[PDB]
Structure formats: C-alpha cells, structure tokens
Amino acid sequence: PHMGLEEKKENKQLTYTTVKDIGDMNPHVYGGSMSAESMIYEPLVRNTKDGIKPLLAKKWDVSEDGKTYTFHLRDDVKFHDGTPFDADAVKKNIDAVQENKKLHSWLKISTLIDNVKVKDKYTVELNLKEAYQPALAELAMPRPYVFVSPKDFKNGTTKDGVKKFDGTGPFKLGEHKKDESADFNKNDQYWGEKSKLNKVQAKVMPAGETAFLSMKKGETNFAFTDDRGTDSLDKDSLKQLKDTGDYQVKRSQPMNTKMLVVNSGKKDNAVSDKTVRQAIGHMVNRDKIAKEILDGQEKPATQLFAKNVTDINFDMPTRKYDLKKAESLLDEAGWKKGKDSDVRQKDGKNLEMAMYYDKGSSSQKEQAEYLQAEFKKMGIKLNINGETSDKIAERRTSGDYDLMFNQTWGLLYDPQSTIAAFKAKNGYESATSGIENKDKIYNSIDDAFKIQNGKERSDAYKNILKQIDDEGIFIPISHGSMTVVAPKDLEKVSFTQSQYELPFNEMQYK
Ligand SMILES: C[C@H](N[C@@H](CCN[C@H](Cc1c[nH]cn1)C(=O)O)C(=O)O)C(=O)O
Ligand code: NI
C-alpha cells in the first residue's frame, strides 16, 4: 500500500476506483457522471446548508412581480479553452437547454422560462411566465443549468452533443481512455478556491476483489459512492483498508431511501396486478436486511421519504414483513400453490418475475439473492440479473423490468424533485404508469407544487404518497449514506447537501 500512496501524495493526486466510466460529459443531458461534472462545470448560484449563495453570478435582483431575475455576473471568469464567461455565454447555454425542454420537465423552472436577454456584457436577465420562488434552487442544480463554452456547441446547440467539455470549474477534463480512466487536472486559472490537488483520476474497474486489491496496492487511493448509489468496497474491505493504517473512512449523514421499484406498467407480468404488488410488499424483511445483510450500517426505511426530510412531517409506515399475508394475497390474486410444485400458477402459467440490480454493488447483489430465496418460499420464480447501472437506468426509462433496486435522490431533491419524477420519463414514470388513478395523482403532483404554505404542501404530499404507497410501487428498505475512503493523511474531506459531489478542490495534503 505505502509505495503507490507515497508517489500520489508526492504528485498531489487522487486515483479513485469506480465501476463505471464517466459517460457523456455534456451536462445539458443526464448520462454523464454527476461528481465528474461538478468538478468542471458550474451554475449561476450554489445551494448550501445556509441557502442560495453567489457563484458565477455575483448578485441578482428579482422584479416586483417575481418574473424577472437579473444576474450580475462575475467578470473575471474564463472557460477552460480560454474563452470568456459573460452574459452571452449564459444566454446561449440556457437557450440550448430550453430547446430540449421535454428532457427537463422534471424541473418546473424549465416549463416557466420564457426568454433570456443580454442586458449588457456581464448582466443577463431571465424572464419567467409566472413568479416561482424555487427558481434559484433549481438554477443551482448540477444539471442542466451549468455552463459549457459556446465554442463547444455543435450546430449552434448542445442538444446533439458538444465538441469538447470546457466549463469554468476548478478542474478541467484531460485524457480520457474509454472504459479505463479519466483525468481531472487542476485548473491553474480558476477564478475561485483553487484546487490543492493537481490531479483526480477516475479509474474504471470491477468492484469486489479487484477494487480491493487496487486500493490495497495503492494503485487507487480513493473511493466514494457513485451517482447510482454504489460503493465499490464492502464493509469487510473497508475494515481491512483501515487496518493497513494508510486509509481513513468517512460517512455522511443519512441522505436517501433505497427501495425496490415495482413496475405497475409491465402489462405482460404479474407485477401489473395491484394485489400481487401488495403481496410483494409483505415479502421484504427490511429489519433483517438492515441488521444482517447491510451489517447495521443503514437504518431500515418504513416510508419513501423520512419524517425529518423537508416538507414531510408525518409518519406513514408501509406494509410490514408478513409471509402469511403475502400468501393469502397471492391466493386472492389466483396464483395458487401445491400440486407437486413449489411454484404458484394461474391459468397453467408459473409465477415468474425478473429483478435487476447493479452488479457493481455487493449489497444490492446480496439483497437480491436473499429476496430470491424468500420469493422461492412464496412460490415465485425470481430471476435476478446483475447489470451495469447504465443499463439499469435504461430499463427504468423504457419500462423493460418487473422489479429493480433503486434509491431516492437525496437532500437537494427529496421529496419535491423525486415526486416530480414519478411522472417523468427519465424518472419513475414507467413504474407509476399502470396505476388506475394516475391522472388524478399526477395532477395532485402538479398542484402540490403550487401550494405556498409549507404545512399545506406537506398535506398535499401526504395524500399523494398515501396513494403511491397503496399501489405498492416503491418498497422502502434502508437509508443510504455517502461513504468515502481516502488516504489517512488527506485533510479537508467533507460532504455537501448532495450525494452527487465532493469538494475535491478543498482536499489536501496528498
Ligand atoms: C433528471 C434525472 N435525474 C437527475 C437527478 C437524480 N439523479 C439520479 C442519479 C443519476 C445518475 N446519473 C443520472 N442520474 C437518478 O436519476 O436516479 C439528474 O440526473 O440530474 C435523470 O437522471 O434523467
Ligand atoms: Ni438522474
């Protein structure tokens, strides 16, 4: 371990282990690694524990009617190709985003942006259809309203890709070898807090033994939970790495709910039947999962968004583990047992379903194997399939799945953006599409977001989530945190409100 660690400390470098590549680094679409994109691209403002703060915009005014935001931009910023950041760059970026506004409909501000006007070189005006108090908060998201050099647009937009990946941030993208590595090099010209690290490299490899050995030999010296929730090192690997004396391990506050998604819209499978979904709701021993399978590292989750989360001020416990209840519900549904078979049948077909998990996640894999044994006791043939997180996301979008592991979006998004995503193609619309009352639930979601009083908004969320919970679309399991393994002599590793970034430009000493 020491040899590789010492070289990297000398070079002021981190090389992090990850199971997936950085993907499409165009931050106006959603495929690219979120933490990589937060290292190189920046929004107008930042959303912190202490609310909205200046970033590329120094200051802003809102009009009396709430419909015009004027942003007074820093005048000392360049993109990484040396081109200038100014009001025209802001306008061309926001306008490029708005050409693809169907992709961004999960974020309400995209449905309100009317136009953008350059008032002068460092002042830009954003006009909305109506007042919208969360505007600043949404403009603070790491996608899509962050700024790419206009020299990198293709055919006058970003909608079909970008030529290179120039932003304003503390790192710039260097060499990328597809499915192997990507370099984030110190931006020596950065307008703000300059990086104390010269290089962060993302090194792509499988999890399990190979990530562990890589970390143990100091070929990699850093790990963190990726944007899909996967930790490359299990609990025994973290223990052994700490036991070397060379690594430290840090863990954030609880940030999310990890859940099973049940596809109501999958017409060709039993999960499209509500009664079967309810049965499945009783087949998930979340207390045992959290205590025995996740080794007590995560608390069990009995609802989608914990009572402590913004605008959720209620306790609404979900279906409990109860295999007898499961069995009578399957019987009610016509899936009958016995007759010399383990598998339940209805009209002479066996009850089969396919569950999908991230093969890079040992904890997802272990839960999936447990649930396969449990489903077997109930007379379900569960076929489990470990896939890339990329391929899991594609199924979430298309609807090609019966059940999948997933997780909510964390402190900046839960509950409001995650609930919006219940009817978004690139969110969980697949899973909610088969609910009988979906028109009204969807309209309730639209309406909840108009309610200004926080207590009433909270009530509107409760009525939505009660009906989502009755449908058995989401089975909460545990609360996830972010975990970071880093060299023991690396100082200043800390967490933001997000599960999708780290302050790489503040970390130092190695
Ligand atoms: C818009 C929607 N999700 C948001 C925020 C939530 N991100 C997580 C994690 C993720 C990783 N890569 C893409 N999304 C999710 O969609 O489950 C975004 O990607 O910026 C999406 O992925 O299309
Ligand atoms: Ni996403």
Side-chain angles (χ1 to χ4, degrees), residues 30 34 143 228 396 409 426 500:
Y30 300 108
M34 293 183 71
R143 299 93 77 84
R228 299 293 189 181
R396 194 181 84 174
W409 297 356
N426 51 334
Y500 300 131

Side-chain angles (χ1 to χ4, degrees), residues 308-327:
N308 58 263
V309 170
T310 324
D311 293 333
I312 302 309
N313 272 292
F314 54 82
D315 179 75
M316 183 195 295
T318 198
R319 286 177 194 90
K320 293 187 225 209
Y321 179 65
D322 183 339
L323 292 187
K324 300 291 182 214
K325 198 74 223 274
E327 289 179 321

Side-chain angles (χ1 to χ4, degrees), residues 254-257 299-316 408 411 414-415 465 476 478-479:
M255 276 187 181
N256 68 48
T257 296
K299 294 314 208 329
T302 54
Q303 52 193 59
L304 194 50
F305 307 110
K307 181 160 180 245
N308 58 263
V309 170
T310 324
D311 293 333
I312 302 309
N313 272 292
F314 54 82
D315 179 75
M316 183 195 295
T408 66
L411 303 175
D414 294 347
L465 296 162
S478 62
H479 292 301

Side-chain angles (χ1 to χ4, degrees), residues 355-368:
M355 172 177 287
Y356 300 82
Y357 64 95
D358 188 347
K359 72 196 218 196
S361 176
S362 62
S363 54
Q364 288 182 46
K365 174 172 51 60
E366 286 187 356
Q367 293 171 86

Side-chain angles (χ1 to χ4, degrees), residues 18 25 76 105 154 230 252 299 307 375 444 495:
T18 173
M25 293 290 291
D76 62 350
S105 59
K154 264 166 51 139
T230 124
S252 71
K299 294 314 208 329
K307 181 160 180 245
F375 276 47
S444 289
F495 296 105

Side-chain angles (χ1 to χ4, degrees), residues 350-460:
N350 286 20
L351 183 51
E352 305 184 319
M353 323 178 159
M355 172 177 287
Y356 300 82
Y357 64 95
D358 188 347
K359 72 196 218 196
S361 176
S362 62
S363 54
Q364 288 182 46
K365 174 172 51 60
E366 286 187 356
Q367 293 171 86
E369 294 177 335
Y370 173 56
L371 289 180
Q372 179 185 248
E374 292 279 283
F375 276 47
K376 193 177 196 276
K377 276 168 186 69
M378 296 300 95
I380 303 169
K381 203 141 177 274
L382 186 71
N383 181 35
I384 66 180
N385 297 289
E387 289 178 343
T388 64
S389 59
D390 271 8
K391 176 57 177 312
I392 298 291
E394 176 183 304
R395 294 181 181 282
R396 194 181 84 174
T397 298
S398 75
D400 189 6
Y401 64 99
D402 309 318
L403 309 110
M404 68 159 58
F405 287 84
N406 224 244
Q407 65 179 38
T408 66
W409 297 356
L411 303 175
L412 305 163
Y413 297 92
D414 294 347
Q416 70 292 329
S417 291
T418 308
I419 294 176
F422 291 175
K423 67 202 252 271
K425 171 65 149 173
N426 51 334
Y428 303 96
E429 185 181 13
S430 54
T432 62
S433 55
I435 293 164
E436 190 163 74
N437 293 331
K438 85 178 188 209
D439 296 347
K440 290 178 179 184
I441 293 160
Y442 285 5
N443 298 334
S444 289
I445 291 166
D446 289 332
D447 292 350
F449 305 142
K450 289 156 185 167
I451 294 171
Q452 278 156 34
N453 173 240
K455 165 57 174 48
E456 282 165 65
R457 197 165 51 263
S458 172
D459 293 333

Side-chain angles (χ1 to χ4, degrees), residues 81-320:
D81 56 7
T83 56
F85 171 79
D86 58 23
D88 195 47
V90 172
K91 178 174 163 57
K92 288 149 143 38
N93 275 266
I94 293 181
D95 285 347
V97 165
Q98 290 304 112
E99 287 175 16
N100 198 15
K101 75 178 72 183
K102 314 301 90 176
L103 203 69
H104 313 297
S105 59
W106 70 281
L107 201 55
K108 185 180 179 162
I109 199 184
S110 67
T111 65
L112 305 188
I113 288 171
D114 184 80
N115 65 86
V116 189
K117 288 176 169 173
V118 173
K119 288 301 302 228
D120 58 72
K121 189 178 205 284
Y122 301 107
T123 120
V124 57
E125 174 182 298
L126 175 70
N127 303 298
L128 306 185
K129 311 315 163 47
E130 59 194 63
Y132 184 61
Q133 168 279 314
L136 287 177
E138 297 182 13
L139 287 174
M141 300 289 190
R143 299 93 77 84
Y145 302 102
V146 296
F147 296 99
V148 178
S149 176
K151 169 169 188 288
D152 293 333
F153 285 27
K154 264 166 51 139
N155 301 305
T157 181
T158 58
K159 171 169 184 169
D160 309 322
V162 89
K163 312 216 261 211
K164 278 166 69 231
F165 303 104
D166 298 294
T168 61
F171 298 88
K172 60 221 279 165
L173 184 63
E175 186 173 350
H176 178 212
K177 306 185 226 182
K178 194 63 134 68
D179 295 310
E180 304 183 333
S181 54
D183 279 358
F184 301 94
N185 301 321
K186 179 185 181 166
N187 176 10
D188 298 340
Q189 288 76 44
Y190 181 56
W191 64 268
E193 195 187 352
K194 291 192 192 191
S195 173
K196 325 300 170 293
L197 298 166
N198 283 343
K199 185 192 272 217
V200 180
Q201 171 183 116
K203 193 166 163 54
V204 184
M205 62 196 63
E209 183 56 19
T210 132
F212 175 62
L213 269 158
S214 166
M215 290 290 283
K216 189 147 102 172
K217 293 149 68 156
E219 295 171 353
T220 48
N221 64 348
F222 199 86
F224 66 100
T225 150
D226 75 13
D227 59 11
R228 299 293 189 181
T230 124
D231 292 301
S232 294
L233 313 149
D234 66 9
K235 187 183 185 196
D236 179 65
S237 297
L238 295 174
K239 163 217 296 167
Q240 291 184 248
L241 288 180
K242 304 224 302 137
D243 287 352
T244 63
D246 301 331
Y247 286 113
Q248 61 171 307
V249 174
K250 299 235 278 285
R251 187 167 281 175
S252 71
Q253 67 186 308
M255 276 187 181
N256 68 48
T257 296
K258 283 175 163 180
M259 76 272 198
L260 224 51
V261 185
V262 184
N263 188 350
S264 70
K266 189 64 153 42
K267 295 301 112 154
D268 82 351
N269 190 265
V271 294
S272 62
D273 180 4
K274 177 151 85 82
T275 304
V276 172
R277 292 198 301 276
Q278 291 176 342
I280 289 169
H282 294 285
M283 291 178 205
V284 182
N285 196 350
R286 64 176 55 77
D287 302 316
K288 181 181 147 79
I289 289 160
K291 191 72 217 71
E292 292 177 22
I293 293 169
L294 312 182
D295 306 304
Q297 299 174 102
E298 296 190 3
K299 294 314 208 329
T302 54
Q303 52 193 59
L304 194 50
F305 307 110
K307 181 160 180 245
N308 58 263
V309 170
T310 324
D311 293 333
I312 302 309
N313 272 292
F314 54 82
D315 179 75
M316 183 195 295
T318 198
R319 286 177 194 90
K320 293 187 225 209

